[PDB]
Design a protein around this ligand. Sequence first.
Ligand SMILES: Nc1ncnc2c1ncn2[C@@H]1O[C@H](COP(=O)(O)OP(=O)(O)OP(O)(O)=S)[C@@H](O)[C@H]1O
Ligand SMILES: [Mg+2]
Ligand SMILES: [Mg+2]
Ligand SMILES: [Zn+2]
Length: 322
Amino acid sequence: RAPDIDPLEALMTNPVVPESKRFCWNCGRPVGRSDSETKGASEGWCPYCGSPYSFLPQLNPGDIVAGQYEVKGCIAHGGLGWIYLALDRNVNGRPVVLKGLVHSGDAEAQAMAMAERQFLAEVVHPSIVQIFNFVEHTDRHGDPVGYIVMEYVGGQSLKRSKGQKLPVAEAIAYLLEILPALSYLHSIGLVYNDLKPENIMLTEEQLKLIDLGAVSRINSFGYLYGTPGFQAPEIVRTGPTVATDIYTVGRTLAALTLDLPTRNGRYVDGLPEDDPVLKTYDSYGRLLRRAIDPDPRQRFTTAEEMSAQLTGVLREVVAQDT
Ligand SMILES: Nc1ncnc2c1ncn2[C@@H]1O[C@H](COP(=O)(O)OP(=O)(O)OP(O)(O)=S)[C@@H](O)[C@H]1O
Ligand SMILES: [Mg+2]
Ligand SMILES: [Mg+2]
Ligand SMILES: [Zn+2]
């Protein structure tokens, strides 16, 4: 007899953060580490900045959030802590995903965080993860914390290491599917702000953008955070813009296709000279340089314009590959 297995079990991870992956959310320094003297604590305070940390899950299997979401366990751990899998009692017990909103804060701070992100529930595009709700629950210490509720997205991110870079045609075809989602965001006065391979999910059917935490209004300065090697150099002066999102498209294509030099764990600005890929596909190299131009006024004016040039480049890459 063949067994009846719950397919959710294979989707979840052991709810322990390995020591090599423990960092302070505030100052970025390693925390919760074992030394030649003492064992690393799963929760405590950062010895350098004094910020509280916890690598323990804040929602346990069987917990019910806002009388609606039945927690099943953990999917992954990130910058905002654990990412939980839950079953939505309003939508037939469909598995959904919960993620925290702020690393720390009192009741008023949590309420303000939920309210400021509520607009994401109105973002509707087939290539952008759907946000279903914003809910409150108590953490492992009894203090109320806010959660974003989102659609469960299948597959894995486009993040590729030095040995598994995508062929140019594949990477372009992927970004051509992403660019209309950016055009859609720009049409409603929003910037995605966090485009990078790790935030793009590849499913059995399509591509989907996740991690809407950086989504912001054009020319606003409330959120300036970004990854060195992906973020536009002028973000401090202009705030997020269509031009900063175009720059991230260029950086994303480069990170998916090129063996980019890295320094202190981040990709260096610009593109390497004599790179075999850029010498092979000239129009592609020209498009990337335009997209990452240090002058934002020199970049593609709109995502629709970039898509039009990119379509032309795909035809040329496909023809060259023969
Ligand atoms: N909606 C989702 N559906 C399925 N898996 C998800 C979903 N959101 C996140 N995950 C998983 O969790 C991983 C990390 O998700 P992210 O939102 O990028 O978290 P992050 O690393 O903490 O970046 P931050 O918190 O937003 S600043 C993804 O690579 C997926 O494996
Ligand atoms: Mg992310
Ligand atoms: Mg984020
Ligand atoms: Zn710290």
